[PDB]
C-alpha cells in the first residue's frame, strides 16, 4: 500500500538547524505533488507549500516562504523540510502529504491531499484561514452539518476538500472535489459547495465520528491550500 514514511521525533533548541524527511513508497514518486502541512500545538492545520518531485517546482505559502526551505531526492525517492534556525514558535507536528490526482491522465486537475505521513513532531524550547465553528456536538443518531465559508479567491472559484482527524494521528481525507467520497468513507458524510461557502453533513453522528474536522480549498490568490481553523466535534452520551 502507498505511504509516505517520515523521520522520527526531533528534540532542539532554538537556534540549531533541523532537517526532516518523508520518504514516498509504493507510487510513481516523481510524478505527484507532496505537501507540508504545520499543526502547532492543540492547534489547526496550515499549508506551508508543496514540491514536485520530478523536477523540485517548489511553491511555498507567503506565510512560510524564506523561513523553511522544502526539497527532494528523487534518487531515494524523498522530500525535505529544512530550517536553518529554529525558533521554540516552530514547536510543532509537520505532515507530508500527496496531492492524489493524476496530473498525466487528461482530465482536468483538482488539489486533494490523498496519503498523509504520520506527522513529526519537532520541539523546540530551553527549559488567513477560511472560517468554521470550532466546535460542534450531538447525541449518536443527531444530524450536524459543519459550515466552511471562504471568499471568492478560494471557495468561490475553487473546489473545496474536508479532512478528518482524530488527535494525535494524521489526517484522513472524507470529502475531495466539494462532494465525492473516497472508498471506505461511509455514505452518512456528504459535501456541498455553494457560493464561497461549502458544508460538511453528517447525517446521523456515530461515536467513532468523535474527531477535528477541516475544510480546505485551493486560493488562486496565494497559490497553494488553505483550511478552515477545524471543528471539533463531540459525540454526547
Known amino acids: 500500500q502507498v505511504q509516505l514514511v517520515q523521520s522520527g521525533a526531533e528534540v532542539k533548541k532554538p537556534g540549531e538547524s533541523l532537517k526532516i524527511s518523508c520518504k514516498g513508497s509504493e507510487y510513481s514518486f516523481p510524478n505527484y505533488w507532496i505537501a507540508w502541512v504545520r499543526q502547532m500545538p492543540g492547534k489547526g492545520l496550515e499549508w506551508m507549500g508543496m514540491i514536485y518531485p520530478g523536477d523540485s517546482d517548489t511553491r511555498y505559502s507567503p506565510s512560510f516562504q524564506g523561513q523553511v526551505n522544502i526539497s527532494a531526492d528523487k534518487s531515494s525517492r524523498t522530500a525535505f523540510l529544512e530550517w536553518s534556525s529554529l525558533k521554540a514558535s516552530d514547536s510543532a507536528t509537520y505532515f507530508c502529504?500527496?496531492?492524489?490526482?493524476?496530473?498525466?491522465?487528461?482530465?482536468?486537475?483538482?488539489?486533494?491531499?490523498?496519503?498523509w505521513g504520520k506527522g513529526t513532531t519537532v520541539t523546540v524550547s530551553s527549559g488567513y484561514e477560511l472560517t468554521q465553528p470550532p466546535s460542534a456536538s450531538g447525541t449518536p443518531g443527531q444530524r450536524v452539518t459543519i459550515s466552511c465559508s471562504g471568499s471568492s479567491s478560494n471557495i468561490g472559484g475553487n473546489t473545496v476538500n474536508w479532512y478528518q482527524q482524530v488527535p494525535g494521528t494524521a489526517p484522513r481525507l472524507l470529502i475531495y472535489?466539494?462532494?465525492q467520497r473516497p472508498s471506505g468513507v461511509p455514505d452518512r458524510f456528504s459535501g456541498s459547495k455553494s457560493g464561497t461557502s461549502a458544508s460538511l453533513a453528517i447525517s446521523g453522528l456515530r461515536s467513532e465520528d468523535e474527531a477535528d474536522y477541516y475544510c480546505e480549498a485551493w486560493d488562486g490568490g496565494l497559490r497553494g491550500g488553505v483550511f478552515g481553523g477545524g471543528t471539533k466535534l463531540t459525540v454526547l452520551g
Open positions: 472535489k466539494n462532494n
Open positions: 502529504a500527496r496531492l492524489g490526482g493524476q496530473l498525466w491522465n487528461s482530465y482536468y486537475y483538482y488539489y486533494y491531499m490523498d496519503v
